[PDB]
């Protein structure tokens, strides 16, 4: 979902990259370091705009992160 | 036996009004002046699509069955008229080995002096029925002339059909992907057509998009 013009719960409602993104996306598993502090959004009235953020909160859930956890790793 | 398609087996290919105008199209149409088989109830191939015509006096011809194996292994189209009402179904029927009329299920429906013309094709999961009814005065052949079959029925079957049979004269020809030029009157009805591969004059009329051409 972390790529220009993607779709899915994050790319619609939580972290959106423009059609005209210009940058690099760099990522790694943190299972060996990271824990229900990490939330994400499931619901919204409409998509957020590219590089928007928000602080209203029911629309959110926690990720199932534990050091036991590949797609379910942090 | 075999007889002539003449200029019959043209139908309205889409749900669109056109008038005083000469429109070119490609669809499964009956090739002009091709041989049609003639029958006075065999299983027949369906191929890409059927043109079927039945000539009448006393309501002899009741309908058809369409599918592949036609004996309960898979779904199979039934189309019937009995006494005063049409019945249409698609079930996994245990049909007879040679069906005739005296004197798992997913879709069901219930409602020579004459000629009744039909075209059948199955495309993109949809069974299409086009037909025409007329009075006639002929025994030995289809009456040489032209008319267009309007669509009547548009069923989202999704059931592969490769063979068919008649339920009780009739005539059968097969549709092909040939280009047709179609002439519409001011009323919006198709009054003539050119099969654009019949002869070099038809190649000319369809290149020039006109039913009539200068020297």
């Amino acid at each position: 979902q972390i790529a220009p013009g993607q779709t899915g719960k994050i790319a619609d409602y939580n972290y959106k990259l423009p059609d005209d993104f210009t940058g690099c996306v760099i990522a790694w598993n943190s299972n060996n370091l990271d824990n229900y502090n990490y939330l994400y959004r499931l619901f919204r009235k409409s998509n957020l705009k590219p590089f928007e953020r928000d602080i209203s909160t029911f629309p959110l859930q926690s990720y199932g992160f534990q050091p036991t956890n590949v797609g379910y790793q942090p | 036996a075999y007889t002539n398609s003449f200029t019959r087996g043209v139908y309205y290919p889409d749900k669109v009004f056109r008038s005083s105008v000469l429109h070119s199209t490609q669809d499964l149409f009956l090739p002009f002046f091709s041989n049609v088989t003639w029958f006075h109830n065999p299983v027949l191939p369906f191929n890409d699509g059927v043109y079927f015509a039945s000539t009448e006096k006393s309501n002899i011809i009741r309908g058809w069955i369409f599918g592949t194996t036609l004996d309960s292994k898979t779904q199979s189209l039934l189309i019937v008229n009995n006494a005063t009402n049409v019945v249409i179904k698609v079930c996994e029927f245990q049909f007879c080995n040679d069906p005739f009329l005296g004197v798992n299920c997913t879709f069901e429906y219930v409602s020579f002096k004459n000629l009744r013309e039909f075209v059948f094709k199955n495309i993109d999961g949809y069974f299409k029925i086009y037909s025409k009814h007329t009075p006639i005065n002929l025994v030995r052949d289809l009456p040489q002339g032209f008319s267009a079959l309007e669509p009547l029925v548009d069923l989202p079957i999704g059931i592969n059909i490769t063979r068919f049979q008649t339920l009780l004269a009739y005539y059968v020809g097969y549709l092909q992907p040939r280009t047709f030029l179609l002439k519409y009157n001011e009323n919006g009805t198709i009054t003539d057509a050119v099969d654009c591969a019949l002869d070099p004059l038809s190649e000319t009329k369809c290149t020039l998009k006109s039913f009539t051409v200068e020297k």
Binding site: - | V16, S19, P156, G188
Partner: protein
Amino acid sequence: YRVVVLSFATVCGPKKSTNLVKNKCVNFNFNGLTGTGVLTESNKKFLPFQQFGRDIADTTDAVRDPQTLEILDITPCSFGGVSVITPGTNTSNQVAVLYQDVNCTEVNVFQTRAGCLIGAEHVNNSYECDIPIGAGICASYQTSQSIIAYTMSLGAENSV
């Protein structure tokens, strides 16, 4: 407790229709087509199975309403060129504007066969060509100075 499961083409949700309106530009849809146009009454006779109707070059120009068994002319929502008639800027900043073909309403106004002209005075005298407009009309900047529009003059007439 009573329970129902509805486990999930022929099963579609209820499509909502709007109330119909005529003789206005609208963002229309009928069944499977969409556009911008004017929906209007017509004398056309489509066959009962026909739902759209067509121009000579592929363009829809009529439809049959899916509830109302009468045929609509669809007329394109009106448009035209905006041409600006100006003296040279080393004279004045006044201008007159030609809305092409539209007949003076949809837009000190003068209907012509070239379109609606706005901001130029219709003068009964004819004069030579200074700025051309079309359909015999010209315009010029003349004296209290203004843009004037009139039928042009082909010459002084002479019975020989």
